[PDB]
Each structure stands twice: as C-alpha cells, then as structure tokens.
Ligand binder design. Structure first.
Ligand code: SF4
Ligand code: SF4
Ligand code: SF4
Lengths: 143, 118, 325, 369, 79, 88
C-alpha cells in the first residue's frame, strides 16, 4: 500500500485536537480544573460537552460515583459519537467502597485508560492523557 | 447571443411552482420558507434596487415576523439611483407625513391589543 | 474569463485562511491576558491548531437520530452563504473586490437580515424541547441591534451621500474616520459585539438552558466577526487612508511613472488589515474583562436607552448640516 | 413548564439535578431533590483522612473541626507550636476555598480571566501543601514544618494582595456585574435565620463562630468586622473579597515562633511523635502499634462543636458508645444548607440569574452529604 | 406584468382553498401585495421616471403595517 | 461569459452539503410581552429603512419636512416606553 501514512495523519491530528468532556464529580474535578488551566492549554482545549455530548470524543470520568448516578454516565457514552475514548480518573471510579457508592465505573462504561490517585496530581492526569493519545496513534502494545 | 438571459422567463415557471408549493406544503414552517423563496424569485425578477429593498423589508422583517409568530404561537391545523425621495419628500410631502401617521398606529395598535397593564 | 476566475480564488483563499487562523489568534491572545500560553504542540510553530480542529470534525460521526434533518443542515449553509456574499462588497481602493455595485451599502444591509433568518432555523429542530423559546430569545436580541446598525448606516450616508461603499471611503479622506461620531463609533462597536456572537450577547444566546456543521457554524461566526469588523472600518475607521499629506511625498521620490511596482495596492491593504485586526483584538479582550447580561437587561439596554439616543443623533444631523451646508 | 438545570456541569462541575419548574418567561418554582453522595465502621484515626474528602478545597479546615470535635470528646488538647500550625494554615486553606467559590461564580458570569487568575495563585500554595504534608490531626498535625516554610512566605505574602486587587478591580468596578448581583439574592434576614444559613451566606446583610467564641489560637490574632450594607449577592461577594484580605492580614500578625517548639501532643498515647528516638524509647511501642491495630477507647457522651470554616458552619456531631471508634458521626455542613435555602431565595428571578445564586451560596457535591 | 398577475391569481385561489389553516391566508395576502407591486414596477419602468415606484414604496410601508397589525391580532387571539 | 460569478462559492457549498433518548425529562410557554418586541421591530425597521431614500436625496431639498417625520416617530417611542416599558 506504501501510503499507510493517511491512516496515521488523521490519528496525529486526532490526538492533538481531541476535545475532552469535564465529568467533574468531586475532588478529581478540581485537579482536572488545575489541568485544563495553564497546564493543558496547548493541545487539550476541549470542554462544554454537556450541551452535547454529540460533540467531543474523549470522556474523562473525574471524581466519585453514586449508585443513583449510574444511568447518567451510561447515557453520556450513548449520546457520544462513534470514535469515543474513555479515561477513568480517581480511586472512586477505578475501584472508597460503599453501599450508596458503586464499586467501579467499568460496570457502567468500558474504560480505555485508568488514572490512579486520590486525587491524581496535575502531572498524573496529563500523563494519562498522553497514554490515551498514544492509543489513538494505533501503538497499544503490552509493556 | 445570451440565450439564458432571453430564457430568463423561467421566473414565471418558478413563481407558479413556488406559489403552488406554498399551498401544498404541510405545516406553516415550509410555507413561510417558500414565501421567502417566492419573494427572492420576485427579487431576481427586479434584476430583469427594489430587489435589495424587498430582501431588507419583506424577507428581512415581514418574513422574520411570520416565522417568529408560528414558532411561539402553537395554533396549527391540517444622476442619482432611482431617487424616489425627490417626490415623496417635496411633492408628496402630505403623504410622507401621513406615512408617519400610518406608522404611529403600527406600533400603538398592538400596544392597545395585547397589553393588560395595571 | 481566466483573468476573473483566478482573481476571486486568491481573495477567497486568503479570507477563509484568515477566518480559520483567528480561532488560534483569539485562543493565544486570551491566554496572554490570563497569564497562560496558547497552542504549542500542534504543527511546528503552534499555528496548525485551526486545521487540526477542522480535520478532527471531518472524521467525527453522524447526527442522524431527526426533525427535518434537511432543515437542520440548511441553517449552517445559509450562515456561510451570507458571510461569503457579504465579503464580495467590501473593497479597499478604486475597485479591489468586483462587487463595485452601483448600490453597495444596501447589499450589506440585505445580508444582515438573513444572518437573523438563518439563526431561528438552527435551534428550531427537535420540538419546543431543549428551549425553542430559548433559541427565539437570541433572534429577538438579533433584530433589536440589527435596527441600530441600519440607524448608524443612514447616519454615514447623511454625512457623505451616495449608496456606494467606495464613495463613502473617498469622502472620509479629510478626517480619516467619521470624527463627529466618536460616541457613535463606540455605540457601533457595542452593537458590533451585540449583533454577532461575542461572549457579551453570545453567552445569552448559547449559555442558558443546559447549553460536520461545527466547522461551518464557527467558520460563519468568525467570518461574521471579521465581516462586521472590516464593515465597521469602511463606515467609520477609514481603511486605505494610511499617511495623510506625507503620502504623495514618499511615493513620487523613486517611482518615475508608476511601473508594474504597484505599492499603492499593498500599503492600503496593510493599513486596512491593521484597522480590522485592532477591532478584532478589541473583540478578544472583551471576552476576558467582561461578565454577562440577562435577556431582559439586553432589550432594556437597546430599546429603552440605545434606540431613543440614536433617534436624536440623526434628528439633529441634518439641522446641524442646515446651518453650515 | 419544567426543566432539569444541568444533569452534570451546571456552574463549574456540580453534578446536581435541579428540577426547576420554570414558569412562563422564567419566574422559578424550585424543586432541588439531588443530595447525592463508613465513618462509623472505620476507627477514630481512620475516619479523619476520609472526613476531609467532603469539601475538597477547604480540606485542611474541614479536618480542623473534626480534630477539635475528637479533642473535646478526649478532654486532652494542649499544643503550642502545634496550635500555631492551625490558625496560619486554617487562614491559608481559607484563601483556597474563597478562590474556587469566587472563580466558579465568575466562570459562568462571563469573566473567565479572574477564574484562571485564581488557579494560577493556587499553584504557589501547593508548595505549602506538598512539602509540609504529602494533614490536620486530632493530636496536632501529621508532621513538622520544613526549613523552607517560614523563611519563604514573603514570595507569596508580597506578590499576593496586589493580584487580589486585579481580580477585585475587574469585578466591583462594573455595570454588568454590579446591576445583577445587587438585584438578585433574597436575604430576608429573619427567614434566612429560619432557613439555617451560615458564614458569608448569613453575615452578608450584617448579622460568627470564627470570632467571639473562637477555636484554638484564633483568639489572640486580630480580626476586623466585615460590614456588609445590603442583603444581596454583591455584598455577599464583597464580604468574601474582604475575607480574602482578612486571610492575608492575619498571616503577617501570626508569623511568630514556628521553627523549634511543641511537636504534636505530649504523652505515650494519641499519635506518638518520636521519629528519631522511637527505637530507644521502645516502652511506648505497645502504645504506638495499638493506635493503628485496635485503637484507643473514648468516654461516652453526646458532643457537638460547630466551627465556622471558609464556606460556613461546618459542624461535627461525634457521639461514642465507649468503644475505640465513635458510634455515630453527623456532618451539619453549609453545602447542605445551600439546597435548603435555594427555594424562596431563587423563587422570583430568571434562569440565567439562577446560576449566579450558586456562586454566592457555595456548592460542593461531597460536602452536601 | 404577466408574472405579478399570475402570482395574484394563484394567491387569490390559494386563499379560497385555505383548508381552515389561518396562517396560510396571511402568507397569501402578503404575496398578493407583492403581485400588485411587480405589475406596478413594470409599468413604472415602461412609462419611465419616478411616479409609480413612489406608490410601490407606499404599498411596501402599508403591507409592513398590515403584517405587523395582523400578526399582533393573532397574539390578541389564542389566549 | 459571466461577471464576478457569486455561484462559484455556492457550488462548493452545495457539494459539501451533500457530503432510546435519555439523560433528561421532557415531551410536556407564552412569554406575553416579548412577541410585541418583534411586532414592533417591523414598523421600527420600516421607519429607518423608509428614511434611507430621503437620506440619499439630500442637498436638493429643505430638511424641515424631513425632520417632521422623525418627530412623529419620537412621540411614538415615548408613547410606548412611558406607557408600558420593556415589561420585565
Ligand atoms: S496509602 Fe493510605 S490508602 Fe493506600 S494503602 Fe496506604 S494506608 Fe491505605
Ligand atoms: S478519588 Fe479520592 S480524589 Fe477523586 S473523588 Fe474520590 S475521594 Fe476524591
Ligand atoms: S506485644 Fe508482643 S512482645 Fe510486645 S509486649 Fe506484648 S508480647 Fe511482649
């Protein structure tokens, strides 16, 4: 084929222009606020996807998750377009165990990249963003 | 030469089709859009200044109002360029004064029809 | 007609590129005010952000699951045509753009009414749900300030006469901008940010009830910014009009006849770019230092204060022209 | 006509599903519902780091009220330098909470520049959060302050205050921001007392747990009376902006002792502080490991010690049966008084007005529960 | 001339084929006003110089008043 | 054969044109004195648009008759706002 580059030209443009949705729930929401502030102002730039979520492709679940919040998270992914990617920020979403709070967000929405921490720092979420950027580039290999 | 300019009688062929489309159109939403299109067809005929005079008032205000009322009120069921000012401001100055008078009623009328003030 | 088809293309290419690039320019200038930095990673210089954003939405997905799915796609097309047809009547010299129409001023006013018409077709789709009555509030705000621009238009024609944009620029030669209209210039700038979508007034129309065509809506939006910005320029600011009295001195020193060395057409365009870019810049720090209005406060600012004020200005403009003639 | 004000992301992030019955041309009929979001099961020491995760921004001040509530139940609480590291840090985390609240208001109310200017200064406070902690404990504090803590405060103390007058000069001197905030906010004083409001939520009109009956070391340091003319959102913001300057004027007047003094709490039990000589002083290892394994018991009795934090009245109802961990722990928070006061106050305004209410009212999803 | 007359005809027939609608009649009356103007403007150009075009602007003002009046009437109705 | 050709910007636009619901409660307002603002735009827009030909035809006429029209319209904006205002 030789010109296999056209499949990656769209990918390099996708990872640098991607618009993430702020699903701010609790503590991780403001660590993400510090991220989307003077830190992720170069290639992130995406927000406002509540009005949609037909617009924006990357879903960042940042914060805690209640047993009653389950139909809302499921619907956001359903209202999202076909090239949808998911990022799980925070211990509450990753795995905090309660009877009023669900054990994991994986039961609701399948996640591509998981970001650990309580709360994960400005550098912690940013790295998780670059790992998902690498997954969009079709380079997902076992480390 | 210029066969398309001679066959520009297509305006009557388009107007008869456009007006028969305003009646046939189910829901007023399509009928107003077709009224705008019919006025744009008439504007294209005024190329054969009044085109731009019509687009600014008829399409610009009248048609905008026609769409503003249907979306809100549910209702439903199934040397100088042509001047003009030389006569209206000097000779027909009486009509100019009365045209301001007809415009008094134009804004005062709805104010005494849909008010309910205390 | 190869001479005319190449002439339009180079103008359209530069206009569309300038419209797209402003999305990066606004992003970087707002960043400097907020103490942060604009785009850096994209391209090489950080200037390829606009193209990358456009290409991202070209792949995307369909919005098929409908309420006349032809009418919902009709609105972003109608906003694009009015924006581009608006540009064909904005010259900068004797006849820079072919739309040297014998009634140029009205062409801009005929379009400024269609940008309102297309707006109520946008949020119209999908019943009364998701505020159709909220989308109609934006179009009612639109018609209010549309009257202000037309009232300012007639004010400029009251001073210079003739419906030609080229003749409007030619008369303003003595005073650069229309100087006896400095508060009216700020009023037309306040109406410029009000008519088009800039946070003060864009927030009222796009931020309220839970709030492919995205590359269009934002293109026509940014087109409407520069369109009304340059549009303000020929009415007031005075494009082409660079150096005064010291213009003829510099030109006649080393040119002899005129030659194919047409510097005239270059200096003027560079002056007009500065005229609109300074207004475009003014359109950017108003995003930064300004809060938000309420719908009822919008109409109260226009219909109650702005409209009877302008009524007085054009009422005295022929009476003050009656004495000196 | 009824609408659900943002299923998520209403003002900043929220989450709140506010069923506002928006009657003809927006008049508002409030029906909040929401109130979404172990302290008993976990031990007395285990409950403390789990407690601060209510109000994320004022987490250190959220820790302070619970630490004082356990102190009152224990009836043993006298640190000196360990008490100095509470008034300073309590008025540092106060800057943090007041930043988020004012910025969340400004974010939706156009002005995006003060919103980012707020988070920019916050990064300078992160050094005071990471280098010291990694914090407020019932027996004092988690650990000792570093050498580069008191030696470099002037880098923040002088550079901040002038930047506070850049956010203030951008909001208070306005037409757009001023006319709205003056009109909105139905602070009817008597009904506002009946609704159980607190802090900048009730002292806006001119009505304080921080003063008069003060909590540890706050007693000696100077505090000015925040005036507040009218009962509206503009005065509410002015009080928060006056509290901003108040939170800075204290630090300079509280800059005393700090390096070398009282570590945490003096005895064998209630968090052992040897660190270096814990191997030589091994007779306290049976005590040290017991605080982590089983946990020390507390006397039975109903206690409630309300403390005014940056948001408002953060009160802990620590009730123990006699065991290591308390029987029931209740959190009477101002964020729960938000949803309680939303009706009647917002009832009689418009939809875009109903967003600016939250900014002054102060809302945190975690703190609500 | 022949265009405006045919527009007037179809609109007058469309008015008396309303199907209760009400909203259709307002659109029809506006197009009848447009039909009269086009035949007058054609006559104005055929005759030459401003006289007919003056009365054409007069109809444009009266039609605009007629539309604003008739639409406010619908608002008085449907309470 | 044609002049300027605006359709050459319309043709690429035509070419480009060709190429269960959850999360919220809905399905189910009359803003009263809001339609009147639009109803008032039509004559107010007419008022300024009708002035346009008189504005073009200056330095040939006497402005006293030209001023009279505007005075009648000033009495109107006064006859509206002082009577009922914008209706908050
Ligand atoms: S970090 Fe704290 S949270 Fe994780 S295991 Fe250690 S003790 Fe538990
Ligand atoms: S993970 Fe820890 S950090 Fe995020 S919300 Fe949960 S409690 Fe907060
Ligand atoms: S804990 Fe184990 S070793 Fe230590 S005192 Fe008891 S028995 Fe002796």
């Amino acid at each position: 084929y030789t010109l296999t580059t056209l499949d990656a030209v769209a990918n390099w443009a996708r990872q640098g222009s991607f618009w993430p949705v702020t699903f701010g729930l609790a503590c991780c929401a403001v660590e993400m606020m510090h991220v989307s502030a003077p830190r992720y102002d170069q290639d992130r730039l995406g927000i406002i996807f509540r009005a949609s979520p037909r617009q924006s492709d990357i879903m960042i679940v940042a914060g805690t998750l209640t047993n009653k919040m389950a139909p809302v998270l499921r619907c956001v992914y359903d209202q999202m377009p076909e090239p949808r990617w998911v990022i799980s920020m925070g211990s509450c979403a990753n795995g905090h165990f309660s009877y009023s709070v669900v054990r994991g967000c994986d039961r609701i929405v399948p996640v591509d990249v998981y970001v650990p921490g309580c709360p994960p720092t400005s550098e912690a979420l940013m790295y998780g963003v670059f790992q998902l950027q690498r997954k969009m580039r079709n380079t997902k290999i076992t480390r | 030469x210029x066969x398309x300019x001679x066959x520009x009688x297509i305006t009557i062929f388009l107007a008869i089709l456009c007006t028969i489309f305003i009646i046939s159109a189910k829901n007023p939403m399509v009928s107003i859009l077709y009224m705008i299109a019919l006025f744009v067809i008439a504007a294209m005929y005024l190329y054969l200044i009044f085109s731009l005079l019509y687009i600014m008032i008829y399409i610009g205000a009248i048609a905008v109002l026609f769409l503003f009322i249907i979306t809100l009120l549910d209702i439903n069921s199934t040397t100088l360029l042509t001047t003009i000012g030389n006569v209206l401001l000097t000779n027909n100055a009486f009509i100019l004064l009365v045209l301001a008078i007809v415009l008094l009623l134009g804004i005062i009328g709805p104010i005494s029809i849909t008010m309910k003030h205390k | 007609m190869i001479i005319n088809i190449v002439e339009i293309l180079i103008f359209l290419v530069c206009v569309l590129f300038s419209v797209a690039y402003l999305t990066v320019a606004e992003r970087k200038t707002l960043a400097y005010m907020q103490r942060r930095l604009g785009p850096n990673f994209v391209g090489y210089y950080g200037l390829l952000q606009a193209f990358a954003d456009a290409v991202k939405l070209l792949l995307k997905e369909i919005v098929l699951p409908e309420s006349n799915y032809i009418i919902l796609v009709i609105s972003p097309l109608i906003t694009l045509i009015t924006a581009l047809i608006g540009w064909v009547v904005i010259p900068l010299g004797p006849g820079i753009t072919l739309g040297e129409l014998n009634l140029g001023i009205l062409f801009s006013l005929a379009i400024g009414s269609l940008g309102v018409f297309g707006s109520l077709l946008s949020g119209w789709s999908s019943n009364s749900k998701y505020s159709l009555l909220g989308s109609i509030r934006s179009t009612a705000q639109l018609i209010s300030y549309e009257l202000i621009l037309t009232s300012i238009f007639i004010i400029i024609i009251m001073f210079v006469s003739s419906l030609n944009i080229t003749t409007i620029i030619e008369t303003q030669r003595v005073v650069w901008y229309c100087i006896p209209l400095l508060p009216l210039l700020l009023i037309f700038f306040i109406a410029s940010v009000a008519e088009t979508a800039r946070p003060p007034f864009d927030l009222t129309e796009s931020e309220s009830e839970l709030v492919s065509p995205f590359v269009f809506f934002f293109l026509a939006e940014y087109s409407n910014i520069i369109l009304i910005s340059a549009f303000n320029g020929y009415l007031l600011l005075g494009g082409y009009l660079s150096f005064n009295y010291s213009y003829l001195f510099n030109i006649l020193f080393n040119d002899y006849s005129y030659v194919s060395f047409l510097f005239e057409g270059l200096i003027n365009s560079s002056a007009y770019a500065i005229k609109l870019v300074f207004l475009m810049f003014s359109f950017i720090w108003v995003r930064a230092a300004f809060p938000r209005f309420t719908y009822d406060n919008l109409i109260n600012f226009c219909w109650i204060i702005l409209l009877p004020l302008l009524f007085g200005i054009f009422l005295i403009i022929p009476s003050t022209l009656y004495i000196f003639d | 006509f009824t609408i659900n004000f943002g299923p998520q992301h209403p003002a900043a992030h929220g989450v709140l599903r506010l069923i506002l019955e928006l009657s003809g041309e927006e008049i508002i009929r409030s029906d909040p519902h929401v109130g979404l979001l172990l302290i008993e099961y976990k031990t007395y020491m285990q409950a403390l780091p789990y407690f601060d995760r209510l109000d994320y921004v004022s987490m250190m001040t959220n820790e302070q009220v619970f630490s004082l509530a356990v102190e009152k139940l224990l009836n043993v609480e006298v640190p000196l330098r360990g008490k100095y590291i509470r008034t300073m840090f309590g008025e540092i985390t106060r800057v943090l909470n007041h930043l988020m609240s004012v910025c969340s208001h400004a974010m939706d109310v156009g002005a995006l520049t003060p919103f980012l200017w707020g988070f920019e200064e916050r990064e300078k406070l992160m050094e005071f959060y990471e280098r010291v902690s990694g914090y407020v404990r019932p027996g004092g504090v988690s650990q000792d302050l570093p050498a580069g803590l008191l030696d470099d405060i002037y880098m923040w103390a002088t550079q901040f205050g002038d930047r506070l007058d850049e956010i203030e000069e951008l909001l208070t001197d306005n037409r757009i921001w001023k006319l709205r905030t003056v009109n909105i906010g139905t602070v009817t004083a008597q009904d506002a007392l009946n609704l159980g409001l607190s802090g900048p939520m009730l002292r806006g009109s001119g009505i304080d747990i921080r003063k008069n009956a003060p909590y540890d070391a706050y007693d000696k340091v100077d505090f000015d009376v925040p005036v507040g003319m009218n009962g509206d959102c503009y005065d509410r913001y002015l009080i928060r902006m006056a509290e901003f300057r108040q939170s800075l004027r204290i630090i300079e007047q509280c800059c005393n002792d700090m390096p070398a003094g009282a570590v945490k709490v003096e005895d064998f039990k209630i968090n052992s502080p040897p660190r270096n000589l814990m191997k030589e002083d091994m007779e306290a290892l049976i005590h040290h490991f017991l605080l982590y394994t089983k946990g020390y018991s507390v006397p039975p009795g109903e206690t409630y010690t309300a403390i005014e934090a940056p948001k408002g009245e953060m009160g802990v109802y620590v009730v123990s049966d006699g065991s290591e961990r308390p029987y029931k722990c209740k959190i009477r928070a101002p964020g729960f008084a938000h949803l309680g006061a939303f009706d009647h106050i917002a009832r009689g305004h418009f939809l875009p007005d109903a967003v600016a209410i939250i900014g002054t009212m102060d809302l945190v999803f975690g703190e609500v529960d | 001339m022949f265009i405006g007359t045919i527009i007037l005809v179809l609109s007058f027939l469309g008015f008396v084929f309303n199907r209760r609608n009400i909203i259709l009649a307002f659109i029809c009356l506006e197009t009848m006003l447009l039909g009269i103007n086009l035949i007058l403007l054609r006559n104005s150009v055929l005759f030459d110089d401003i006289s007919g075009s003056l009365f054409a602007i007069v109809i444009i003002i009266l039609a605009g008043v007629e539309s604003a009046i008739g639409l406010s009437l619908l608002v008085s109705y449907y309470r | 054969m044609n002049t300027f050709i605006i359709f050459i910007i319309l043709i690429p636009i035509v070419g480009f044109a060709l190429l269960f619901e959850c999360g919220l409660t809905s399905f189910n307002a009359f803003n009263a004195a809001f339609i009147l603002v639009a109803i008032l735009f039509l004559p107010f827009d007419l008022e300024i648009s009708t002035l346009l030909p008189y504005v073009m035809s200056i330095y040939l006429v006497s402005n006293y008759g030209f001023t009279i029209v505007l005075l009648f319209l000033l009495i109107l904006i006064i006859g509206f706002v002082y009577e009922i205002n914008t209706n908050a």
